Amino acid sequence: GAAQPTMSVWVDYIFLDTQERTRFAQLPHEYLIEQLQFTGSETATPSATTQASQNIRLNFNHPTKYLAWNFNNPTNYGQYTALANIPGACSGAGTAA
Amino acid sequence: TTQASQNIRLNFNHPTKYLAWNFNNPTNYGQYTALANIPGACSGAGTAAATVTTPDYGNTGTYNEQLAVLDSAKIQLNGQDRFATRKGSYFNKVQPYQSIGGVTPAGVYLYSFALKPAGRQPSGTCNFSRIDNATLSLTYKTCSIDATSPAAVLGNTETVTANTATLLTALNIYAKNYNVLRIMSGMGGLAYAN
Amino acid sequence: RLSAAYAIRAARISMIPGGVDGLVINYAEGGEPAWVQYPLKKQKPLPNNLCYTPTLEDIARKREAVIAKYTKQPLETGTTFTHVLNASHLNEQYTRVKKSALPDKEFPIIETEKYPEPPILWETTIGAPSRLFDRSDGVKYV
Amino acid sequence: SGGVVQLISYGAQDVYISGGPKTIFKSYVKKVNNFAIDSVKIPINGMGNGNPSVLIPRNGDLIKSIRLEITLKKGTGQSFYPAEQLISYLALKIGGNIIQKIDDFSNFCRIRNELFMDPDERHTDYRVNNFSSSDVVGSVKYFFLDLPLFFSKDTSVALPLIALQYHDIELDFRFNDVSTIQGVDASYTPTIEMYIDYVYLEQQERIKLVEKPLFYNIEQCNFYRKDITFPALSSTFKLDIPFNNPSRFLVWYFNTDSFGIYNTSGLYFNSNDAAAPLESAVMLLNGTERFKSREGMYFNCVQPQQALGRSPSSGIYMYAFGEDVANATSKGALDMSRVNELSLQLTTKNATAANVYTVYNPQETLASSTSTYKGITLFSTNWNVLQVRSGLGAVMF
Amino acid sequence: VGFGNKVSTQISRNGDLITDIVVEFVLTKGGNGGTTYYPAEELLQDVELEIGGQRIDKHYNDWFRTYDALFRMNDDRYNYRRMTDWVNNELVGAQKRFYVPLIFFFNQTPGLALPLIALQYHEVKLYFTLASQVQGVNYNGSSAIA
Amino acid sequence: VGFGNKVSTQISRNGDLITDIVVEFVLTKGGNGGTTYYPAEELLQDVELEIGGQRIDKHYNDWFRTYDALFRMNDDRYNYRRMTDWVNNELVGAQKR
Amino acid sequence: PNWNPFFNRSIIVSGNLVVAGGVIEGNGGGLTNSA
Amino acid sequence: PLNDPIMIRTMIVYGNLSATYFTGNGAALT
Amino acid sequence: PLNDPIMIRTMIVYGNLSATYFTGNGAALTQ
Amino acid sequence: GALNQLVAVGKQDAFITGDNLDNSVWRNVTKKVSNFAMESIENYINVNPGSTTSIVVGRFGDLVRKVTLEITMKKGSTTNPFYPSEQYVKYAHLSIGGQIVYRIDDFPTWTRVHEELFMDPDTRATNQRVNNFRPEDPVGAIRKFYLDIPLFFTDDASKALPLIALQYHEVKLDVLFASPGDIPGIDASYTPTVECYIDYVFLDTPEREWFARNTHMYVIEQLQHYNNVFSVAAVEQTKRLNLPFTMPTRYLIWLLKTGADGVYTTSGYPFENNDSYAAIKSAKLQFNGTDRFSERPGYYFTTVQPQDAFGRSPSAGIYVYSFGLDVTGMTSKGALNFSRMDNATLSITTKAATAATISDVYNQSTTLASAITDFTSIAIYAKSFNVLKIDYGMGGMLFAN
Amino acid sequence: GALNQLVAVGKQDAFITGDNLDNSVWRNVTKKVSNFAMESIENYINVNPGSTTSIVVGRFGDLVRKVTLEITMKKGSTTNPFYPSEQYVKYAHLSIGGQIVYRIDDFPTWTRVHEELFMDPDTRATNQRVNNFRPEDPVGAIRKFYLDIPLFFTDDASKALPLIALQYHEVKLDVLFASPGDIPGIDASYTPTVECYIDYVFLDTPEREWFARNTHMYVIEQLQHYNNVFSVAAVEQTKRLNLPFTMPTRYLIWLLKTGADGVYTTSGYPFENNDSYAAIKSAKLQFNGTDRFSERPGYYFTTVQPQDAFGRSPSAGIYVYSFGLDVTGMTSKGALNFSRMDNATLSITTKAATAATISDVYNQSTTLASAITDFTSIAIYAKSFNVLKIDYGMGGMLFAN
């Protein structure tokens, strides 16, 4: 019985005065702007006795400000860490359930 | 079991204001709709003596779409549709609403080429002297409802009607034309004839 | 297998069309010099006949002329008033014309729009692949 | 010395048929201007509302093909070409002006594909429109229906979208409720998503492509249906042909109340002409006969065997006006704007007993015909000209 | 499209001018005769006209009812009732195709027809607000009709 | 509009410059308190910007979570979650914009 | 029309043969059909 | 191909049949 | 050579079927 | 996306990218052909009492491309017939101006070869649909079959008989129907009705005048037939068969038959792809005592040569070897001139006729079913080149044979 | 009758009809080619150690167009072997002048893909008749198999190896045959007999002399091969596969195999067309960190990409993406230059191993039978362009890689 979402996009528009509108409309412009580069990959995460190594090949271009990364359990949006029987770390944590 | 289609070939000429048509039971003048055991529609209607084969004549005309026999129609000119398919309820209500401004009873249909077909000043036309062929494509309702049961006649969907609609065996398509009457030296006649 | 000594006799007895001229014929018995060809006659009139009928582009032109004629002119005039009074008028015009003479050219919606701002070439770009600059693949080993 | 002998075995007989500069072992090449192709996933408007349509976004210079991805499930019903039967209508319009209109879509697609597709494309068509019988009930798979649009027949008549700068291209189409299919599998809202294949050209081709006017000699599809009450006796139907544009072939058949069934057999793919409804047909031009009436089997297999090579299932009948109906080049056509009267006379077969193997005469068909048949349909594929000038595209006639 | 939803449409430039626009609905009556009162007009609540994104005006649910009761007259008003309601004592389960003509400045007379041929740089569209509760179709008073 | 569907919006040039875009989603939960985690954020899993037929940028489900988890800070990030999650132990049937 | 109608002769099967409906024939075979 | 041996609604065979296993109801000779 | 058969997997037929004689291991249902 | 493919380019692309001229696959370079009409004019056929009937092609058009020979017959037995329309026809001789120019001898044999060699699955299956009728229909059912006669001019419209250019004489073909009651096995004492429908092309005056008046020379194919007795024994016997053929040929086909039915293998059935039912072990061609190639196995001629020549391999019993690299198109690409070589020979080695119950106890590679001893003859077909000259209203062959 | 359509014309017709110039359907123009002969010449194999076989192509003619590898084997067991003629071959490396110019690595895999992807029914059925021994024949039967080597010059005669133009160095093919008992699974330990037959074209003197002396640049295809170890699990795994390719390619193929047999699916049998037995969920092909297209389902790549390009679609487990729009003709129509895009990566997302059987518990669209955990590798093939320059009797590659 789950419902579909309702959605719409709200855009904040900026209206300029007469004089600068001419400048923006007629003159050439260049903007120095940001992009995101992303491809997914998979880890080799061992259970016991091993600390695995993995060399992941990177496919990036242009002047990069930073590289950030995370690990997830694909079944739960945002599960960055392991689940455990401690407060806030799993369902029912702290109880026999 | 089916909503039949029927291609009615038109034999009209000249610039016209409009095409109008009805589905008539030839034995009963003005019977353009199905007859059913609902108030005012049949002889004895509402009582055990009701019969759905004889209309309550003085109230032959009705405003009940469920007794109409036309489900949808389109006019096709030289093999190409002139407008997208509209339901029978459009031609009975919507077209005369914006074109005439009056109320037309169920079973009488109008499509106009004219902005003001009720007026005498020309308001647009369609010249059927230069169109090679035109067809009025009709889709009928499935006439599966037992006319004697008002529970079904007054409670069903727009795509079905009463079994008595099958008695509407005659189709009457009319075209409202233009011509010019010329008068000269005591004699006259039409400017155009086809 | 002819020796070219029999090139004409063969052409005659077998009723081969025209003459041997312009045809290639085998010669004697060996080193088959297959290049031996009899020159074709240029004084070779075509059969004289009246097999031609009006060409199709001329018919097409006539049919278009007919379409133009009846666009403006009537098909038949009910010339019932000829010497009647002064009524050169009152002769009904008959206008339904057979299909073959009707136009089938549709409205020139391309030419009537007259957009105030004429077309511009819709160029797009993903920029230059600058990682490939000063890296020609046309350089050869020497 | 086999090849040596074959070369020594020479003479005038060889000079007439071979020789000269032309050498197949010349090892020559042809080149084309560079291009690149990708598939852009685009949304469909109005899918759950009423009549959906798409506007083609400017993600490239030419449009070469559009196909629709439909995902749905198996539910024991055993249906044929679901991807086609979920769609009832498809049209393409340039600037609001319809230039290709497909009515009775599901049967059009099946028939056009069976007539023109060869064993490899037709078999794959099956594979991407149907289910795999081996699958578990409830399984879900992707369907990829290639839309039979006039510009997808041949790379070279791809829509010059860059050249249509002022009005856009809209594809309107309609869907059947999922439950409509006689063998419907499930009350499962199918996922329906469209992909459009865009072509990128080189810049110097974009310049001359927009600057000069374009004329494309293209196909148009059309449709006429006339419902009948099918006789027990071999009477003749008078089928008018209210069409205008020049055509290379026309296809007609007697339809039933289901999808894809064009004969009385009740098997789905019917190769057996015994269940075929048509005894014979003759086409008339200006009220006069073009040929002696030929039997339904002539139009069912002999004519397409010559014109296309491929024979449809029993019940589909075709007549050609040219020499090579599958070609991208016009190879003969009849001009329906100039012939005053066009009609096709169809004489149906006489009713006989069920258990169809039993039919004895070419003139006999099943008595089941009266119940199953609802009508006669006609398709005619016509030539017209798509003109593009200064940013505006339209059909000339 | 549905009860309480907001939808919109942009007018494809199929022709040169726009005049009558008619909104149609397919709807099933959830009650018996006399339970509904212009259910097609209640369902179609607000209509907002934009030309190129600039608002020209907005019609509201209650206005439609006022205009119909205030300016539309004689045969024209009854015909309208036929276009928006059940007028023949129809019973529960009946389904009908309803039409609700719009009344913007270009919807009543051709002399004010909207000139799309001259507005190629201002796309024209309509925003619609549909009712969450329609009397006799999904609610009877405030009671939901299952 | 629906779960698993792709939709787009054409940007009407109502103004001169365009800047902040905020997408509104209306969701009704079927779970209990603490059973959701940025449900409006995972809802938009692949959003991308084109200008004139070509891609400028492309963002993903976990990029939004990674970027907010990494680059957003303060009361500002709590407010962000207020906009994308249920933060008051809301019960089955609750609906939020 | 190919493979959807019936066969001429001599079907060799490397696996099982599965039917829903009925099979119209009889002969020696596996462990049964011989008593 | 001859690698999806799945049929719907019809079958008859003239010659002999050879197989490993089998299933279905029984109306068989001997 | 296109119809004449070599079955490499399980053949399935959803309907009445016939043949002259058979030859193979038997585990049918009814007999 | 895809635009990356066009920016990341360099010299390597110079060998695949074209010039700025219109050699691209778009901006179609439209080709156009003149307007024409076609009509199927029925031909009257004179009575055919198990004898020759002449079909005369009248001047009811400019070109004729194909001849459709329609036969209506009824099944008289429970045996399923094998191409009964082709078995009923025994031969067809085509003559121009009274001179025989094309012959199909032992007609059902050549057309079954032709269908397997030239027709694709859809064309092949369709040709069967209009010539065979094999559902389990009752005895006495009547069906019409539509048999196209494979004449030299039917394959490509451009070689259609240039009849308008032959003003002084007609063109006819003599078709003989030997018997319904001999080989089909489905006779019901019923004389089949035979009708012939042929097409005509009608050209407009510009080409019609040019074509009817100018001299023409068409390169055409001719079919040559030879047969001999070909028995097989229980030992690996050989045969050395003379090949009495003339003119350049593109290929030759030879087959072994039980000329009692359309069966070329010991299986007793058509379309057998198992070489265990075919006799030829190896073969070579020889010209003037010198060998064209090392002996190749029988299976090589049934499954390998066909791949280069046709893109299609017949069933066993039909053996083909090609001289050209393309034998189905219109352009000649290699041929051997049988008019210059005086002694052409086909040398065949067979397998031993010692095997029985082939599915169980067949020997390995040197035997075949002993049923081969019921084979009687070998037929050899070849397609040769000739030239049809049309000049001043008369046509004929340049090379008489 | 038909003449009605010929005369009933107008402007709409005249626009699309042709003029009276020589481009009409008829008026057959005779086409000629130079005089040449084809011969099939036995080429004796000097190498039989049960290891790498070197087959040197003798200069027995002017051009070599096709290579046929003839292998004799016996049916080792009851189970029907699956292309035993091609499984016996492990690779074929073609070299010219000592330089390796074409590599067919993991040979049965490329030929099975080649057959299912690029060959039609008539040639697929033939290729099986001479490679895929599955009739119900007795165990121990001996058959001769005739496989082709799919080298760059065997698709069109115009690219035939111009051996006469290679006066100083020869052409040789290195074929390694896998031990008979390693993979086929159906072998009698009977050592296969291997013979090679290839054809030669003989040109007549004018062209033969010109051709041998005229330096010519041949634009040819090359086959590039990549493989790696690949495994799947009970989760929807994703992997980045490196693509170490150079030179413009028209398409790229990858397949997921259980490299024990010719099986690419969970079925465990030679062929399957049901995507539910294949373990690929979706894929995209990426270059330089930027995506040419969004992830499309595994089924999309098996059927839609090759159908749009050339009709045909392979069995499941075989996935194809085309860079151009025509990959089977000789003209290059679209290619991606792998020498200009530095980082080429194939991104594959698999289906989860969750089901026991497909017919009982197959999930909606992202799982299949756990049998997929027996997958061992993904092989990738691509066809690139290069130039074979034959100059002063020596040959080699113009572009070094």
Residue numbers in the entry:
A (entry chain aR): 196 to 292
B (entry chain bg): 244 to 437
C (entry chain bP): 4 to 145
D (entry chain bE): 3 to 399
E (entry chain bf): 50 to 195
F (entry chain aR): 50 to 146
G (entry chain cP): 6 to 40
H (entry chain cO): 7 to 36
The article reads:
The icosahedron-shaped NCLDVs have a roughly icosahedral outer capsid composed of hundreds of pseudo-hexameric capsomers in the icosahedral faces and one pentameric capsomer at each fivefold vertex. Each pentameric and pseudo-hexameric capsomer is composed of five copies of a penton protein and three copies of a major capsid protein (MCP), respectively. Immediately internal to the outer capsid shell is a layer of minor capsid proteins that stabilizes the outer capsid. PBCV-1 has an outer capsid with a diameter of ~190 nm, an inner bilayer lipid membrane that encloses a 331-kbp genome, and a minor capsid shell in-between the outer capsid shell and the inner membrane.
Here we have extended the fivefold averaged structure of PBCV-1 capsid to near-atomic resolution (~3.8 Å) and obtained an atomic model of the viral capsid by employing a symmetry relaxation procedure to distinguish the unique vertex with the other capsid vertices of PBCV-1, and the “block-based” reconstruction method. The atomic model contains 7135 polypeptide chains from 30 different kinds of proteins, with 15 kinds of the proteins previously unresolved. These previously unresolved proteins include five variants of the MCP that are involved in composing five types of pseudo-hexameric capsomers, one kind of penton protein variant that composes one type of pentameric capsomer, and nine kinds of minor capsid proteins. Type I, type II, type III and type IV capsomers are homotrimers of the MCP, MCPv1, MCPv3 and MCPv5, respectively, while type V and type VI capsomers are heterotrimers, with type V capsomer composed of two MCPv1 and one MCPv2 subunits, and type VI capsomer composed of two MCPv3 and one MCPv4 subunits. Type I capsomers are present in all the icosahedral asymmetric units, while type II and type V capsomers are only present in the unique vertex, with type II capsomers located at position a, b and type V capsomer located at position d, respectively. Each pentameric capsomer in the eleven common vertices of the viral capsid (hereafter “type I pentameric capsomer”) is composed of five penton protein (P1) monomers, whereas the pentameric capsomer in the unique vertex (hereafter “type II pentameric capsomer”) is composed of five monomers of the penton protein variant (P1v1). Compared with the type I pentameric capsomer, the type II pentameric capsomer has an ~7-nm-high “crown” structure formed by the DE insertion of its five P1v1 subunits. However, the association between the type II pentameric capsomer and its neighboring capsomers is reinforced by loop 179–197 of insertion domain I and the C-terminal bridging helix of P1v1. Below the type II pentameric capsomer is a lipid vesicle that has an ~7.3 × 104-Å3-large lumen, which is supported by minor capsid proteins P9, P15, P16, P17, and P18.
